Amino acid sequence: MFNNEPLEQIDKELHDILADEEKRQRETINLIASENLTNGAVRECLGNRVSNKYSEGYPKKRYYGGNDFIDKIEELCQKRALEAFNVSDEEWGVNVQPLSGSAANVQALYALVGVKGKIMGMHLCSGGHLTHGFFDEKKKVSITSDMFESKLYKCNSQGYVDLDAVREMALSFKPKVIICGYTSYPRDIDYQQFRQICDEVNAYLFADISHISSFVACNILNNPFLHADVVTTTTHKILRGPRSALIFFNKKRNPGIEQKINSAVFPSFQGGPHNNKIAAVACQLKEVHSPAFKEYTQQVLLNSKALAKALISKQIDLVTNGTDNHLIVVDLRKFSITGSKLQETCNAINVSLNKNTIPSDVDAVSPSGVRIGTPAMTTRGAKEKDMEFIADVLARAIKITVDLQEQYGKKLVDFKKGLPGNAQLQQLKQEVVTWAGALPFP
């Protein structure tokens, strides 16, 4: 007693838009540092009947039975995770249940410190996530600043983490957790110095490596597993997995943390796990460990380097004047155009990037930069040579954003009126579309 008519026939209305979405994704130059393109295999798992099953609990300690095959999938996924990130399953445990990055960071923070507990994180404006305790004066914006008591450290004038100020704050604040690893930070992290500071105060070291996860796995960047008590990552960014999250915990450094973390995820916060997610993660976490993926991850940095270099060659300023990872943040102050305006301009030419604060931006009302990243375009087959053109297209978009601001003014209402119909944007959009449309597309 069900309708099994294919998606096109059952609901033509929805299918049209999803087929439109498919076209835009195919015809866009996607520089969103947090985005990627899933392979078919991952998407077969996301569409499997394994999501019919309720399996509240952990494997072999399930609430319901009939969970033998589900138990195998969850166990295989935790194994591949610990393998992929080069940790022994004796020293490191992992929870594969978090439905996303924000849930994992709240779950993990709760486990360690509990309600009212004290936490330190990088400020949002300076590169930190919302779930690192972000708040405004106006409101406790993230639950992490409300259910916990939170303090926020900044990056210095030159766009680097200021370890001295981290210690200034950590000795006076005496936090129970210090979070490092960030959403829009273009350089590597001194996890050792963070570990040093946490010991001095007795705090936990929490490393959120969602953006740089493949660099850590592939031993291309600093390994936080040597120093951190807790490591969280999403699975959908540079890892190229589905929308989910992983919580790692150092058993050896803190016995009893396994239960604290596992009990925080279920039953403190979540209910039934989403098994299709867990299964999809399994399928990617195989791929992570194959040397072809190290090849990929290397290409991500090589492209990121060549993209930073070409932008500099065209006299565009970058925060910290370069990158150690997959992402760049452009400082647009010399052109007197906001990231607000350049995002609209890049939208009009099928270039996905996002506006981003820079250290000089005191408040997040009108950020002076844009963030870009290479994971997505690398996945579609683009090499170092191809970055000059992306650099070219971005330069041309910046120049046209100056033109349109001179013509229509500094207000964003007025600015946007200039975009529809502008001959150069149409010209440029079409170049973008011709080159992007033809690239390998999983």
Ligand X SMILES: Cc1ncc(COP(=O)(O)O)c(CNCC(=O)O)c1O
Ligand Y SMILES: Cc1[nH]nc2c1[C@](c1cc(-c3ccc(S(=O)(=O)N(C)CC(F)(F)F)cc3)cc(C(F)(F)F)c1)(C(C)C)C(C#N)=C(N)O2
- Residue 352 buriedness (CB in 10 A; 0-12 / 13-18 / 19+): middle
- For the CB of residue 101, give the shortest distance to ligand X in the complex, in Å: 2
Q: Token pair of 256, please?
A: 């009893």
Query: Choosing among ligand Y, a second copy, ligand X, none, which partner's interface includes residue 357 (Cβ < 5 to 8 Å by kind)?
Result: ligand Y
Q: Given the complex with a second copy, which of 169 and 342 has the nearer CB atom?
A: 342
Cβ-contact 176, 118 below 8 angstroms? yes
Taking CB under 6 A as the rule, does residue 130 contact ligand Y?
yes
Q: How far apart are CA 231 and CA 252, in angstroms?
A: 14
The residue from 196, 347, 366, 424 that contacts a second copy (CB under 8 A) is: 347
Q: Given the complex with ligand X, which of 161 and 404 has the nearer CB atom?
A: 161
The residue from 100, 193, 196, 424 that contacts a second copy (CB under 8 A) is: 100
The residue from 167, 243, 309, 314 that contacts a second copy (CB under 8 A) is: 243
Taking CB under 8 A as the rule, does residue 106 contact a second copy?
yes
Which part of the chain contacts a second copy (CB under 8 A), choosing from 61-69, 220-228, 312-320, 413-421? 61-69
CA angle 83, 88, 94 (to 5 degrees): 70
Q: Token pair of 6, please?
A: 């294919």
What does residue 32 show for φ and ψ, rounded to 5 degrees? -70, 115
Q: Token pair of 409, please?
A: 């003014």
Q: Token pair of 163, please?
A: 């370890």
The pairing of strands 177-180 and 149-153 is unpaired
Q: How far apart are CA 236 and CA 244, in angstroms?
A: 7
The residue from 127, 175, 242, 418 that contacts ligand Y (CB under 6 A) is: 127
- Following CA atoms 346, 347, 351, 355 in sequence, which dihedral angle do they give, to the nearest 10 degrees? 70
Query: Choosing among ligand Y, a second copy, ligand X, none, which partner's interface includes residue 17 (Cβ < 5 to 8 Å by kind)?
Result: a second copy
The pairing of strands 369-373 and 354-356 is antiparallel
- For the CB of residue 311, give the shortest distance to ligand X in the complex, in Å: 20
Taking CB under 6 A as the rule, does residue 267 contact ligand Y?
yes
Taking CB under 6 A as the rule, does residue 61 contact ligand Y?
no
Classify residue 220 by its DSSP letter.
Answer: S
The residue from 89, 199, 200, 295 that contacts a second copy (CB under 8 A) is: 295
The pairing of strands 327-331 and 369-373 is antiparallel
The residue from 95, 126, 142, 223 that contacts a second copy (CB under 8 A) is: 142
The residue from 354, 368, 374, 378 that contacts ligand Y (CB under 6 A) is: 354
Closest CA to 220 of 248, 247, 188: 188
Q: How far apart are CA 79 and CA 286, in angstroms?
A: 10
Question: Any idea which residues carry the catalytic annotation?
Answer: 54, 56, 208, 234, 237, 243
What is the footprint of a second copy within residues 10-49 (CB under 8 A)?
10-11, 13-14, 17-18, 20-22, 24-25, 28, 30, 32, 34-41, 43-49
Q: What does the binding site for ligand X look like in residue numbers (CB under 6 A)?
A: 34, 54, 100-102, 105, 129, 131, 182-183, 208, 210-211, 234, 270-272
Taking CB under 6 A as the rule, does residue 138 contact ligand Y?
yes
Closest CA to 311 of 405, 415, 389, 421: 389
Q: How far apart are CA 326 and CA 307, in angstroms?
A: 10
Query: Choosing among ligand X, ligand Y, a second copy, none, which partner's interface includes residue 367 (Cβ < 5 to 8 Å by kind)?
Result: ligand Y
Query: Choosing among ligand Y, ligand X, a second copy, none, which partner's interface includes residue 208 (Cβ < 5 to 8 Å by kind)?
Result: ligand X
**Interacting residue ranges for ligand Y, rule: CB under 6 A:** 56, 63, 124, 127-130, 136, 138-139, 141, 183-184, 267, 271, 354-357, 364, 367
